Amino acid sequence: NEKLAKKKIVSIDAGRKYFSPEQLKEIIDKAKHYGYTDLHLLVGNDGLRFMLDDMSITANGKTYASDDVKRAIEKGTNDYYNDPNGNHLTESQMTDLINYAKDKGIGLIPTVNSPGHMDAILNAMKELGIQNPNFSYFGKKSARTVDLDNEQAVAFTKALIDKYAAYFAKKTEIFNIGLDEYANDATDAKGWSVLQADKYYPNEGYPVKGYEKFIAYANDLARIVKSHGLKPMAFNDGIYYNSDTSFGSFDKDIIVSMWTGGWGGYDVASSKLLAEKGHQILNTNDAWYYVLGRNADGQGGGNLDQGLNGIKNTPITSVPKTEGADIPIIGGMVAAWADTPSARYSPSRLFKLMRHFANANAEYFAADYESAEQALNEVPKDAIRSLDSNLSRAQQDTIDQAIAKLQE
Amino acid sequence: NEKLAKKKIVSIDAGRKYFSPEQLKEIIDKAKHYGYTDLHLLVGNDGLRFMLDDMSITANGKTYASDDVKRAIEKGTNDYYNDPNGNHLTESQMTDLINYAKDKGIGLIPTVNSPGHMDAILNAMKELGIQNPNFSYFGKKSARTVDLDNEQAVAFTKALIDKYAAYFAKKTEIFNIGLDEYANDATDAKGWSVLQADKYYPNEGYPVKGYEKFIAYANDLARIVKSHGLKPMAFNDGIYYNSDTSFGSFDKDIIVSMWTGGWGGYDVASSKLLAEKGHQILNTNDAWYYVLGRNADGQGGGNLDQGLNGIKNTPITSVPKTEGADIPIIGGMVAAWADTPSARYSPSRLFKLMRHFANANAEYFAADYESAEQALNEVPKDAIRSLDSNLSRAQQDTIDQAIAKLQE
Numbered sequence: 131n132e133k134l135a136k137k138k139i140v141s142i143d144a145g146r147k148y149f150s151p152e153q154l155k156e157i158i159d160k161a162k163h164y165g166y167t168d169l170h171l172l173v174g175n176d177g178l179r180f181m182l183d184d185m186s187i188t189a190n191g192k193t194y195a196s197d198d199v200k201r202a203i204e205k206g207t208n209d210y211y212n213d214p215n216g217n218h219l220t221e222s223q224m225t226d227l228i229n230y231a232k233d234k235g236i237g238l239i240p241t242v243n244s245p246g247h248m249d250a251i252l253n254a255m256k257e258l259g260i261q262n263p264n265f266s267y268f269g270k271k272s273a274r275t276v277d278l279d280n281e282q283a284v285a286f287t288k289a290l291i292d293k294y295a296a297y298f299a300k301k302t303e304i305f306n307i308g309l310d311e312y313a314n315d316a317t318d319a320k321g322w323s324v325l326q327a328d329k330y331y332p333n334e335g336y337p338v339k340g341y342e343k344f345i346a347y348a349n350d351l352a353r354i355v356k357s358h359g360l361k362p363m364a365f366n367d368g369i370y371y372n373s374d375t376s377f378g379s380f381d382k383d384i385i386v387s388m389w390t391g392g393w394g395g396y397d398v399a400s401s402k403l404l405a406e407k408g409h410q411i412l413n414t415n416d417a418w419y420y421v422l423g424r425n426a427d428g429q430g431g432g433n434l435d436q437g438l439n440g441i442k443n444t445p446i447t448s449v450p451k452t453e454g455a456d457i458p459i460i461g462g463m464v465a466a467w468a469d470t471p472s473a474r475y476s477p478s479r480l481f482k483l484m485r486h487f488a489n490a491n492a493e494y495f496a497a498d499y500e501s502a503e504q505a506l507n508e509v510p511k512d513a514i515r516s517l518d519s520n521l522s523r524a525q526q527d528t529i530d531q532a533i534a535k536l537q538e
Numbered sequence: 539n540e541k542l543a544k545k546k547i548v549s550i551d552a553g554r555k556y557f558s559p560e561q562l563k564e565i566i567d568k569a570k571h572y573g574y575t576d577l578h579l580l581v582g583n584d585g586l587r588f589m590l591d592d593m594s595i596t597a598n599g600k601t602y603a604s605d606d607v608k609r610a611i612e613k614g615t616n617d618y619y620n621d622p623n624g625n626h627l628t629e630s631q632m633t634d635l636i637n638y639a640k641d642k643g644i645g646l647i648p649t650v651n652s653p654g655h656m657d658a659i660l661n662a663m664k665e666l667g668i669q670n671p672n673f674s675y676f677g678k679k680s681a682r683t684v685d686l687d688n689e690q691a692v693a694f695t696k697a698l699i700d701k702y703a704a705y706f707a708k709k710t711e712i713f714n715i716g717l718d719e720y721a722n723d724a725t726d727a728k729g730w731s732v733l734q735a736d737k738y739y740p741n742e743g744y745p746v747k748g749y750e751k752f753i754a755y756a757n758d759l760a761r762i763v764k765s766h767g768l769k770p771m772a773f774n775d776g777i778y779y780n781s782d783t784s785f786g787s788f789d790k791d792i793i794v795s796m797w798t799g800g801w802g803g804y805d806v807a808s809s810k811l812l813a814e815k816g817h818q819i820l821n822t823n824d825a826w827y828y829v830l831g832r833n834a835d836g837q838g839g840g841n842l843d844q845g846l847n848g849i850k851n852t853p854i855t856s857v858p859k860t861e862g863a864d865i866p867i868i869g870g871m872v873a874a875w876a877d878t879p880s881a882r883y884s885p886s887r888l889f890k891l892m893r894h895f896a897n898a899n900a901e902y903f904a905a906d907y908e909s910a911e912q913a914l915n916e917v918p919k920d921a922i923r924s925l926d927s928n929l930s931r932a933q934q935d936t937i938d939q940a941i942a943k944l945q946e
C-alpha cells in the first residue's frame with residue numbers, strides 16, 4: 131500500500147542537548163514499535179555532539195590537526211551548554227547505533243546544521259585561529275551564524291560537512307544540511323529578508339550578494355553530500371524565500387523538510403512552488419512540534435499539549451502553505467527539540483507524542499507485530515501466524531484480538 | 539458534543555451563475571441529509587442575482603427609484619453573463635427558500651460582495667448616472683472593483699448593502715460582506731499591496747490612503763450589518779494584509795472566512811494573528827474548492843478531483859496559515875464556485891463534494907436519521923426509536939443496521 135510505503139520519521143535534537151546511546155536505542159525501539167521508518171538525529175544544531183575518530187580538516191592551505199579540532203569543538207559545544215549528561219557521541223557509538231537501528235528496519239538521518247544554528251562550529255573555528263567567523267548585523271554579532279563573506283570560515287565549515295558526509299556514506303541514505311533561520315538571533319528572525327535586502331535597497335549597509343552567496347553555499351553543500359552517495363535534505367524557510375527566483379536556483383535533489391508556512395514579515399515559498407521546482411517534500415509541520423520542558427498551554431510555543439493538539443488537528447497529509455494544491459510528500463516527520471537544553475528529557479512524554487502521531491495517522495503506520503511475536507514466545511515451551519504481515523495501526527485491534535487468545 | 543455543535547457549511551456561488559429556487563431546495567435537502575447546518579449563498583459575486591421588491595436607494599442627496607435600480611442591476615448582471623437559466627431570485631422566492639431551509643434546521647448565510655467582485659453593481663451605478671465608479675490602476679480599469687475615492691459610488695454601495703441587510707434581518711444570523719481580492723483583474727492579483735503601496739513608496743502614482751480607506755469601508759459595512767442585528771463575515775485575504783497593523787484596525791465582530799494561506803507576493807495575515815486580534819474563524823480552506831466545469835486534474839485550479847483530494851488530505855480542523863498554533867474555529871465551509879458561469883451545474887458532482895466533506899470529517903456531522911424515519915414509515919400501516927438522536931456520521935452504520943431490519 132502507498133500510505134504504508136511513506137516515510138514516518140521521529141526527529142530528536144541531540145545537537146543542543148546530549149542523548150546517550152542507551153536513550154537513543156530506546157527511542158529506536160519505540161519508533162519501530164509504532165510503525166516509524168527512520169530516526170532523524172540532529173547532532174549539529176547550535177551544539178555539536180558527534181565526534182569522528184579522525185577530525186583532521188584540510189582547508190585554507192593547511193590542515194587543522196584532529197586533536198586540535200576535537201578540543202576546539204568539545205569546548206565550543208560546552209560554551210553553548212556544558213551538559214552534565216555528556217558532551218558528544220563517539221564514532222564507535224554512532225556506528226553501533228546505526229547498525230542497531232538498521233537491524234530493526236529503522237534508518238538514521240543525521241543533521242549537521244549550517245550556516246545557521248552552528249554556535250559550536252563558530253566557537254571552534256575561533257579557537258583554531260579563524261578570525262571573525264560570525265555574521266554581524268549592524269554591530270549585532272550572531273552567535274549561531276557564519277558570515278558567508280568569510281572565505282576561510284566557509285571553507286572550514288564545508289570541509290567539516292564533507293568529513294561527516296564521508297563517515298555517513300553507505301551507512302545512511304539522507305543527510306540534512308539544515309539551512310534554517312539564517313542569523314535569527316542577530317536579525318530578530320529577519321535573516322532571509324536581510325540577505326535579500328541589498329539587491330532591492332542598495333547602499334544601505336545590507337550584505338552585498340548576501341542571499342546569492344547563501345544559494346551558492348547551499349548548492350555546494352548539496353554537491354558535497356551527493357559526492358558521498360547521499361541525498362541532501364534542508365529545512366524550507368530559506369529556500370526561494372519570498373518566492374524570489376531572481377537570486378539564483380536551488381539544486382533539485384535537495385529534499386525539503388517543510389516545517390513552516392511562515393508568519394508576519396517572514397514570507398516563505400509555498401510547498402506548491404517548491405514541489406513545482408522539482409523538490410521532494412518531507413512534511414515536517416510545526417503544528418506537531420514538542421520543545422522539552424514545555425508541557426502545557428501557557429508554557430510557550432511547542433509545548434507538549436500544543437503538539438498533541440496539532441497532531442490531532444493536522445494529519446500527516448496536511449503540508450504547510452499548499453496554496454490548496456495537491457502536494458506529493460515522501461512522508462512525514464514529528465520533531466522534538468531542546469531549545470532549553472537543560473530541561474529534563476522525558477522518555478514517556480516523547481513516546482506519548484510519537485504514539486499520538488502514529489495513532490492519529492493510523493493507516494500510514496505499520497501495525498504492531500512485536501506484541502504478537504512476544505505472545506507466541508510466551509507459550510509454555512514444553513491465527514497469529516496466518517494474518518497478513520501488512521496491516522496498518524488502523525487494523526491493530528485485529529492483532530490484539532489474536533493476542534487475546536493467551537489461553538490455548 | 540463539541541464537534542457536532544460546530545457549523546458545517548456548503549457554499550454556492552449564485553452570484554456569477556443563476557440557481558433556481560428548486561435547485562437550491564435540492565441542495566438544502568442534501569445539506570440536511572449529510573449533517574450540514576447552513577447554506578452559504580452568494581447572491582452578489584461579480585453578478586448580482588437577488589432583487590428586493592423595493593430596490594429604491596437613498597444616497598448622494600437623492601433617491602434612485604426602485605424601478606430604475608432594478609433595471610440597472612438586471613442589465614448590469616446580464617452584461618456580466620446573461621444566463622439563459624434566469625437573471626435573479628425574487629424576494630418572495632428568497633423568503634420561501636429561507637423558511638424552507640429553517641423548517642429543516644438549515645440556516646442561510648447570504649453574500650453580497652464588495653468592494654471587489656461587484657461587476658453588476660458598478661455597471662448599475664454607471665447606468666444610474668454615477669460617473670467612473672470603477673477603480674483604475676495605471677490606466678487599467680477594474681471591471682469588478684469600486685474606487686474608494688469615488689464618494690458617490692461608495693455611498694450608493696453602502697446603501698445597497700444596508701437595503702439587503704434590512705431584508706435579511708431576523709431571517710438570518712450572518713451576513714458575508716465578502717471583501718476578497720480588491721481589483722484582482724486590474725492589478726494582476728496584487729490589489730492589497732497596491733492599496734498599501736503609497737504609504738511606503740510615496741509620489742509614485744499609488745492610491746493615496748488606499749488601504750486606510752479600505753479599512754474604513756470594511757468597518758462601516760460591519761456597523762451597517764450589525765445595525766440590523768446581523769453578524770458580519772468577510773474573506774481573510776484583505777484583513778491585516780502583510781500582517782500590517784499600522785493602517786488601522788478591523789472591527790472584532792467580523793467573522794473571518796479563512797480561505798487562503800496566500801502565495802508568492804500575496805502575503806496574507808495568519809489565522810493566528812487574526813484569532814489573536816479577536817476574530818472568530820470559519821475554516822474555508824481552498825483545498826476543498828470546486829469550480830463548476832473543472833472535473834479532473836489538468837482542467838485547472840479548483841477542479842473536482844483536486845477538491846476531493848483536498849477534502850481527503852486536509853480535514854475540517856486544518857486551517858490555512860496557523861503558524862502551528864491551535865486556532866479555534868466556529869466550524870468549516872466547503873465552497874462550490876462558478877468562475878465560468880456558463881458551465882453546466884451538476885447536482886451529482888456537487889453532492890459528491892458535499893458527501894466527501896461530511897464523510898472525511900464524520901465525527902463533526904450529525905448522523906443521518908432521515909433514512910431511519912423513512913424506514914419506519916414504509917412499514918405496512920395496517921430498536922430505531924431508542925437509539926440516541928445524537929450520533930455522528932462516524933456511527934452511521936449503527937443506524938444502517940437498524941434499517942437492515944426491514945423484515946419485521
Ligand SMILES: CC(=O)N[C@H]1/C(=N/OC(=O)Nc2ccccc2)O[C@H](CO)[C@@H](O)[C@@H]1O
Pocket residue numbers: 247310311365389416417419421431432467468469861862
Ligand atoms: C527548523 C526549525 O524548527 N528550527 C527551529 C524552530 N523554529 O521555530 C520557530 O521559529 N518558531 C516556532 C516555534 C515553535 C513551534 C513552531 C514554530 O523550531 C524549533 C522549536 O522551537 C527549534 O528548536 C528549531 O531549532
Ligand SMILES: CC(=O)N[C@H]1/C(=N/OC(=O)Nc2ccccc2)O[C@H](CO)[C@@H](O)[C@@H]1O
Pocket residue numbers: 453454655718719773797824825827829839840875876877
Ligand atoms: C474568496 C474566494 O475564493 N475568492 C475567489 C477565489 N480565489 O481563488 C484564487 O484566487 N485562487 C484559487 C483558485 C482555486 C483554488 C484555490 C485558490 O476562488 C474561487 C474559485 O476560483 C473564486 O470563484 C472566488 O471568487
